[PDB]
Design a protein around this ligand. Structure first.
Ligand SMILES: O=c1ccn([C@@H]2O[C@H](COP(=O)(O)O)[C@@H](O)[C@H]2O)c(=O)[nH]1
Ligand SMILES: O=c1ccn([C@@H]2O[C@H](COP(=O)(O)O)[C@@H](O)[C@H]2O)c(=O)[nH]1
Ligand SMILES: O=c1ccn([C@@H]2O[C@H](COP(=O)(O)O)[C@@H](O)[C@H]2O)c(=O)[nH]1
Ligand SMILES: O=c1ccn([C@@H]2O[C@H](COP(=O)(O)O)[C@@H](O)[C@H]2O)c(=O)[nH]1
Lengths: 215, 208, 215, 208
């Protein structure tokens, strides 16, 4: 399933992120804001039970309990995802965190990259509980989807209850590549850009998310 | 306009607020969360302008700019709105904030403003957001609105967690242009003016 | 006792607060920072116990437990103390909060005010456990100390274990008025300004803290 | 110089980190807290200039400006420094941040840098802060310093939570000019290279 969260405020924030004049401090501030917002949107898609609660007025009434808020594992793809994850963690205070350091092998060919070698320089992920945990993989940008696909090949083996992918900008090619292979993944993004340049960067995109956030 | 924000997560949070076992620390924590969420929902109803920005890729593309974010006045109705406003202020950093308290001296008992300190409201420009976690008889909200409507702001938003059917109808019938945001609308008020099922006295729940 | 927290970074932050050109957003941001810092400094004065803790290496070693982190009541003096309290709550996540709305009856040029009438328009304070709770009264500015004295009159009756007063700027007069009457109160401040003008404002001070933060 | 920040609150937080029962959520929360605290302590060792500011009362008074806050490069040694650096970056919002990882293959087994992405360090101007919650044999820290010192930064700070007596001496004997901040200095290391009593493998404690 594809969830494009393109409401006025999210597009307003995204505009700030795209703007090449937005410095690191403000870029991070806006990315955290989007992490909170996407966490909110994701929360509204989680399973939930109807419960009964007693108010101070001695009366009982129906309520809602999203039990899955207790079963979340967020995978932080360094370096770029750090601010996004900080925002997501605000939405899921009980989420355990896992980290994956990923970097693409740069390219500059005569044609637009379809695939790219991704080397994982660091990996520490908590035990994912099959059929129980909801895994949220966070990475601001999805271009060729090579990074996400490499992370997914491992996550899918854990057989989580559900897999969410949270990005800010995904390319049409990337979204297609992910959902066509894993059609049951919940892919959240704010905008879907049409293309990539010869270097594998998203156009219009926002540049290298890592550098935009931390220089 | 009535905006009942009853999404799974807001209903989950409301459940924690209603729960008598939720202590003040957790009660306030949830009120802050709702302030942020309602601020987000409100932000999506504001006017916006299409702008152009250039990305680091040296390409220009269309963007969005909600200029209204620069013109906001948040009014904290004294009782248990401090946490709600904390959240709203995170949603609207450029907002100026004021406080106002009303007290008495299925209910139309007259209330009066005992204290008020609200920043200058710019007519036809400012979007005023009035926060109060609970709207029961609506006497308090109506009294505050009487004051606010005089400033002739561009828009008036009301942010509440639980509003009574009675209060919702009374407010929106008198001021149909107001944007009333609430998480739930409870059916009745007891003899003492409490919302049933409600969540008790918000002041006691937050600072008691 | 008096604790003047005037380290380079707090003075740097205070400089931003004093600057008339610092907007509401940055004034609040810096006040929150001072709340965190003052919370940190206050924490280092709390009673604590030496405990034993087992590390993953299968060995036990000495540790510290500031049990009183669980026994704190923070009194938020509206409307100016809000951001300060926000920061303090970061240092004391288990603190219960109480609120007091206070507003001084304004006075014109006649004689530098020695005391003033303080109107308490709102009050909701949690139960303070005598001899157990540590009460922290937060208010960015202490000028004539009229506001603080009015709040203390009630707080002292609860006979808390200890009373802390946290301000950003206090006047020499205010500090004297508080400690001379309540010598056992722990008064924390970043700077002590020499005087008050004819309207009871601290000089050089930073203006009306409420307006500086919220307009 | 050696700066052991062993105040009641840091020792309290350290105790929670050492506690084998503290889960990763709370372990990371406490690391962020120490990042902020150590950032505060580091901030107080920086140079500052005297400036004048005008208050709303229309008078000018002396103020302080820590210009060094504009020139900071934070290096995250890969293992469990993410939460630590999160706190440090809150302390130094203008800081640029990089990452670096070193691996192998009472101990001197050599390490090598397998990955590094660090922003440009301005010689004689930048204050570089290298973060790693644990300093055991110090092989990793020394390996990282090899490259950093080449940038000739104005100052080099090291931010750790627990450092071994061996590592503290080794680093500061080789680089006497480095500002090493740590919360505690533990006496020994075991065959595997763990600090005793320490707190275990920080990476597992934070993300395991
Ligand atoms: O315009 C772009 C394209 C890619 N990336 C980085 O590349 C990774 C994904 O690219 P890909 O593997 O989807 O091609 C992400 O971790 C992200 O940091 C960017 O930062 N900006
Ligand atoms: O169940 C209730 C009903 C009302 N109120 C509070 O009592 C005041 C009176 O509201 P109203 O009856 O004027 O609507 C308001 O501050 C409101 O938040 C509560 O805390 N809980
Ligand atoms: O320069 C000043 C002097 C006083 N106050 C306000 O007055 C109260 C304290 O003044 P006093 O009662 O100590 O005279 C505080 O709540 C504070 O908001 C200011 O904001 N700025
Ligand atoms: O008890 C220990 C000892 C070391 N390390 C980690 O192992 C690596 C090796 O440190 P060193 O032996 O090179 O000092 C570093 O990333 C350090 O954080 C731990 O997590 N726990």
């Amino acid at each position: 399933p594809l969830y494009v969260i393109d409401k006025p405020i999210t597009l307003h924030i995204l505009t700030q992120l795209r703007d090449k004049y937005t410095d690191q401090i403000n870029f991070r501030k806006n990315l955290v804001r989007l992490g909170r917002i996407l966490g909110y949107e994701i929360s509204n898609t989680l399973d939930y039970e109807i419960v009964e609660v007693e108010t101070p007025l001695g009366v009982k009434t129906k309520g809602v309990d999203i039990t899955d808020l207790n079963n979340i594992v967020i995978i932080n793809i360094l370096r770029a995802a750090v601010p996004l994850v900080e925002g997501l963690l605000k939405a899921f205070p009980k989420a355990r965190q896992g980290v994956i350091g990923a970097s693409r092998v740069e390219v500059d060919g005569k044609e637009v990259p379809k695939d790219m070698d991704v080397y994982i320089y660091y990996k520490k992920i908590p035990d994912i509980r099959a059929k129980v945990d909801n895994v949220i993989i966070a990475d601001p940008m999805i271009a060729t989807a090579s990074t996400m696909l490499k992370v997914l090949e491992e996550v899918v083996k854990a057989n989580p209850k559900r897999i969410y992918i949270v990005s800010i900008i995904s390319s049409e090619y990337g979204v297609n590549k992910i959902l066509s292979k894993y059609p049951f993944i919940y892919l959240f993004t704010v905008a879907i850009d049409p293309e990539l340049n010869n270097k594998g960067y998203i156009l219009p995109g926002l540049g290298d998310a890592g550098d935009r956030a931390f220089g």
